[PDB]
Structures are given as C-alpha cells and as structure tokens.
Design a protein around this ligand. Structure first.
Ligand SMILES: N[C@@H](CCC(=O)N[C@@H](CS)C(=O)NCC(=O)O)C(=O)O
Length: 240
C-alpha cells in the first residue's frame, strides 16, 4: 500500500494531544477513521515542531497535516485544503479583574504572546500595520497554547486571542478560573481543516469523499462529542 504521512506539532487539546506516548485527539482520530481499512493507503502520524509541519509539506516530506488549521488565502496558495471537519469560534481572553480590555478595539498598548505563522499572529500583525500610532505589543513564542494561557493567568501579559474549544479546555483542565472569555466576530466560517501538500490531488479526492462518508454515518458527530463534549461540525452543505 501507499504510506501517507500526516504531520502535527501535537497541540492543541482536544484536537491533538498525546496519551501514553501516542498521538490522539479529534483530528487524529478523524484521520485514522478516513484511512481505516483502506485497500490503497496506510496512514502514519509524525510529531514535529510547528515550523516543520509546513516546511515538510513544502518539501513533500509529509502528505498531510492536522493541527487545528484555519483557512487563509496565503496558505491556500501553497497547500491544498481538504473538506472542513470542525467549526469552532474565535475568542479573546483577559483577566476577570481587568476592565480595560472589553473587545478587540482595546488591545492598543496591551501585550500578548503569539506563535509565528498562526492566523491570530497574522491578524494582529495586520492590526499593527493599521494602528501604527498605538500598536498592540506582540511577543512571539514557540511555547504551546496551554503554556501561553498559564502565563496569561500568571500575569505575564494582558490578553490572548484563540478559539472557544481550545480556551475552554485549558481553563477547565488547568483550573484557570481568573480568566474571562469574550466572544469575537468572524468574517469567514471558523472551520478547521486537514491540509495536504500541493500535488496531492488524488489524495484530496479520497480524503474529501471519506470526510463526507464519516459525516453521514455519524462518526464525525460521535468523535466530536467524545473529544469536545458536544457537536461542533460545519453545516452539511459546507462539508466539501
Ligand atoms: N487555527 C489557528 C491556530 C492553529 C493552532 O492551534 N496551532 C497550535 C500549534 S502552533 C497552537 O497550539 N497554537 C497556539 C497559539 O496559536 O497560541 C491557525 O490555523 O493558525
């Protein structure tokens, strides 16, 4: 069979995480189900640093990637997007005792920690290009999401933008009960997608076909409830 290597950096829970030395989480199990009993393909998951996920797709080292990945035009120019597999809205996190940040309009002169090449880093970089008189303070980090949330709770900086499921998960698991969650709007549907290397066109056709099948047989809903506690799926009409 043809071996398909799926890369991930291992964050964030419950989309991706490790248990007993092995990768699991919603996206990992959705991909396992896509290839289960495939007469053509065998799947293998590999954990690598974040920058390595994209660099590996670029070099054709990896066939696919799952990593709580959002859509952007820039990514679409370099990689293929499979059908979406989850819907998860954006949020702004601040300390509950801080009344100075109530929306995304209040981040000027305030500090955060962001990861290179993420959609939130790109949004904030663009915010700074527009608001040159009072930019937000970005400190880039290679730490993963949980660590960043802990630092926010520790008072190391003022706010953090991320998504609902990832934020709620860390607030519950890490007991970060001093953090307040503010809903944020979205221009586009906040969907999460597997990405494939450019040229993996035949693979994309198979993956897309399987994602639709797993939606129809109830597997996506089953896995969503298992990992997230409720159904967080794209509308059926957008699953393509
Ligand atoms: N949905 C966003 C974030 C993806 C994501 O969850 N990245 C992982 C690995 S770098 C993470 O833990 N991010 C933490 C963060 O962006 O603070 C994107 O597509 O860029």
């Amino acid at each position: 069979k043809k071996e398909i290597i799926v890369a991930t950096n291992g964050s964030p829970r419950p989309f991706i995480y490790e248990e007993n030395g092995e990768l699991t989480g919603y996206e990992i199990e959705v991909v396992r189900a896509i290839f289960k009993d495939s007469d053509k393909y065998d799947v293998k998951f590999e954990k690598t640093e974040w920058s390595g996920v994209f660099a590996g797709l670029d070099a054709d080292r990896y066939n696919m990637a799952v990593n709580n990945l959002s859509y952007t035009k820039e990514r679409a120019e370099k990689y293929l997007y499979a059908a979406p597999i989850a819907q998860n809205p954006n949020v702004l996190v601040v300390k509950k005792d801080d009344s100075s940040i109530k929306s995304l309009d209040d981040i000027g002169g305030k500090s955060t920690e962001v990861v290179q090449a993420t959609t939130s880093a790109k949004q904030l970089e663009a915010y700074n290009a527009e608001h040159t008189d009072n930019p937000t303070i970005l400190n880039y980090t290679k730490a993963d999401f949980q660590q960043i949330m802990v630092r926010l709770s520790d008072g190391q900086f003022d706010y953090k933008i991320f998504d609902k499921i990832g934020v709620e998960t860390v607030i519950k698991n890490q007991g970060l009960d001093n953090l307040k969650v503010i809903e944020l709007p979205s221009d586009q549907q906040p969907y999460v997608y597997p990405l494939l290397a450019q040229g993996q066109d035949e693979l994309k056709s198979f993956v897309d076909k399987r994602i639709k099948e797993l939606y129809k047989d109830g597997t996506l809903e089953k896995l969503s409830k298992q990992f997230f506690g409720d159904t967080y799926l794209p509308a059926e009409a957008d699953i393509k």
